[PDB]
């Protein structure tokens, strides 16, 4: 919706910022077990609640 509240817009902004993939220098640290970002969300699949 074009009409939206400030807190809704802020929550959307945080969720959008969280959706990037991991930096390529992570996976080759020493004590690392992370292969990829498993929390990525697609707008078609999962609908953010709300």
């Amino acid at each position: 919706s074009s009409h939206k509240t400030f807190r809704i817009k802020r929550f959307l902004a945080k969720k959008q910022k969280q959706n990037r993939p991991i930096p390529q220098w992570i996976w080759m640290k020493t004590g690392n077990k992370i292969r990829y970002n498993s929390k990525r969300r697609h707008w078609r699949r999962t609908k953010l609640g709300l």
Binding site: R7, F11, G49, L50
Partner: protein
């Protein structure tokens, strides 16, 4: 009609985000949170669901002040003094 066809009509929401507990349980028409009962002074907590009690109990969050007092206690709440300088 009562199923798939009816599922298309839902386009206005019943709940929104609570200002106290943060969950999406603030009933707008009743103006009341269904998880913490926000307008009430006391938080909503029934002990017929230990899982719900343990989901948002004291040990779950930042503990940004209780964590500090836990270690202040180990010195008798020492205050107003500093270690000897070099």
């Amino acid at each position: 009609t009562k199923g798939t066809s009816s599922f298309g009509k839902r386009r206005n929401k019943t709940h929104t985000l609570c200002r106290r507990c943060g969950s999406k349980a603030y009933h707008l028409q009743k103006s009341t949170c269904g998880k913490c009962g926000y307008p009430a002074k006391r938080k909503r907590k029934y002990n017929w669901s230990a899982k719900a009690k343990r989901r948002n109990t004291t040990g779950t969050g930042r503990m940004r002040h209780l964590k500090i007092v836990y270690r202040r206690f180990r010195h008798g709440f020492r205050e107003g003094t500093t270690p000897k300088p070099k």
